[PDB]
């Protein structure tokens, strides 16, 4: 297979939040079969970012998910051609983020082309006022719809000062070539920023994911 235990990551994100443009590029590595990955992100345009960095982290590849033998792996199946996904993230206070990622493979490195667009975040909200701490772990529900894979997850950001800020995710994954379709299943996720400088110009982001079924 084209999927090897150790692979590299390279990405560029171009986006905007409340109409203000920015761009971030990253370099990382991961273990597709263990569902582990790490990366170093750097703001190239639009910094210092005037919004909570956390609204970006889950946009920074389900190929990095431990898939058991009894569960069809939609993602690892799609390479070398690769796959792409679209997502809408609806926050409880009206803020909404749309994102897309086109994932291709070059040798042993995945290449991401990411677009990010968020709007309607309240000026006094947790995002614009950067009052988030981290995302809580989550469980994504994945199911097939019209020959493609859909995935929804109830997300929540812990807020500095107590409480949580809820956001609902709705994603569509599209393999660039025909692959076997899986049965309804789940993917546990745990994303964490391990380090970063004061204004988040540099960020070290890690993620751990594992799939499973009833």
Q: Cα(70)–Cα(91) distance, rounded to whole angstroms? A: 34
20 labelled ligand-binding: no
SS3 76: helix
What does DSSP say about strands 83-91 and 109-119: parallel, antiparallel, or unpaired? unpaired
Question: Tokens 């490195």 belong to which residue?
Answer: 109
With contact defined as beta carbons under 8 Å apart, do 118 and 15 qualify? yes
Q: Cα(24)–Cα(123) distance, rounded to whole angstroms? A: 23
Burial class (CB in 10 A: 0-12, 13-18, 19+), 19: exposed
Q: Cα(177)–Cα(2) distance, rounded to whole angstroms? A: 14
208 labelled ligand-binding: yes
At the top level of CATH, the class of 1-214 is mainly beta
The DSSP secondary structure of 152-177, one letter per residue, reads EEEEEEEETTS-EEEEEEEEEEEESS
SS3 55: helix
189 labelled ligand-binding: no
Q: Cα(125)–Cα(119) distance, rounded to whole angstroms? A: 12
Alpha helical stretches, state H, 1-92: 54-57, 74-77
Q: Cα(62)–Cα(52) distance, rounded to whole angstroms? A: 24
Q: Cα(85)–Cα(74) distance, rounded to whole angstroms? A: 12
Alpha helical stretches, state H, the chain: 54-57, 74-77
Q: Nearest Cα to 42, choosing from 21, 61, 28, 63?
A: 28
What does DSSP say about strands 36-45 and 138-145: parallel, antiparallel, or unpaired? unpaired
With contact defined as beta carbons under 8 Å apart, do 98 and 119 qualify? no
Neighbouring CB atoms inside 10 A of 57's CB total 18
Q: What are phi and psi of 77, to 5 degrees?
A: -70, -35
Q: Cα(39)–Cα(194) distance, rounded to whole angstroms? A: 10
Please name every residue paired with 100 in a beta bridge, in sequence order, or none if there are none: 86, 115
Could you say which DSSP state residue 118 is in? E
């Amino acid at each position: 297979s084209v999927i090897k235990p150790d692979m590299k990551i390279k990405l560029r994100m171009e986006g905007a939040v409340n109409g203000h443009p920015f761009a971030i590029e990253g370099v990382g590595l991961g273990k597709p079969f263990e569902g582990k990955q790490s990366m170093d992100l750097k703001v190239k345009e639009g910094g210092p970012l005037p919004f909570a960095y956390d609204i970006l982290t889950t946009v920074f590849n389900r190929v990095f998910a431990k898939y058991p033998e009894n569960i069809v792996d939609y993602f690892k199946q799609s390479f070398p051609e690769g796959y792409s996904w679209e997502r809408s993230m609806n926050y409880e206070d009206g803020g909404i983020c749309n994102a897309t990622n086109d994932i291709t493979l070059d040798g042993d490195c995945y290449i991401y082309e990411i677009r990010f667009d968020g709007v309607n975040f309240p000026a006094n909200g947790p995002v614009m006022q950067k009052r988030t701490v981290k995302w809580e772990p989550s469980t994504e529900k994945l199911y097939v719809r019209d020959g493609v894979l859909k995935g929804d997850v109830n997300m929540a950001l812990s807020l500095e000062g107590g409480g949580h800020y809820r956001c609902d995710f709705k994603t569509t994954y599209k393999a660039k070539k025909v692959v076997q379709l899986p049965d309804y299943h789940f993917v546990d996720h745990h994303i964490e920023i391990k380090s970063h400088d004061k204004d988040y110009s540099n960020v070290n982001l890690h993620e751990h994911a594992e799939a499973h079924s009833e």
